[PDB]
């Protein structure tokens, strides 16, 4: 989507492999605030917004 009309997706009730995304390393920028890219798997999240 365009930046002004940015798309929001709620992702819930599932198991997410954040580590595989970080391992892929196809992304120029992977900045995490209040959290680290590693140890994301250990953490549980009430809801995820993409």
């Amino acid at each position: 989507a365009s930046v002004y009309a940015w798309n929001r997706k709620r992702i819930s009730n599932c198991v997410a492999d954040y580590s595989v995304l970080y391992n892929s390393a196809s992304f120029s920028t992977f900045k995490c605030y209040g959290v680290s890219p590693t140890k994301l798997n250990d953490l549980c999240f009430t809801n995820v917004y993409a």
């Binding site: 970080y22 391992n23 890219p37």
Partner: protein, 49 residues
């Protein structure tokens, strides 16, 4: 410490930086005090094929 890396991986070779080249090849400890020096070597290193 002598090695050649891809220009994108230069950021990974730093203390407290996680990347594929940092994780499986060269790891820099956060504590050590040192100078990291990188310069472009496109002319000699790169070759056809």
């Amino acid at each position: 410490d002598s090695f050649v890396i891809r220009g994108d991986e230069v950021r990974q070779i730093a203390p407290g930086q996680t990347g594929k080249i940092a994780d499986y090849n060269y790891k820099l400890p956060d504590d050590f005090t040192g100078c990291v020096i990188a310069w472009n070597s496109n002319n000699l290193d790169s070759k056809v094929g």
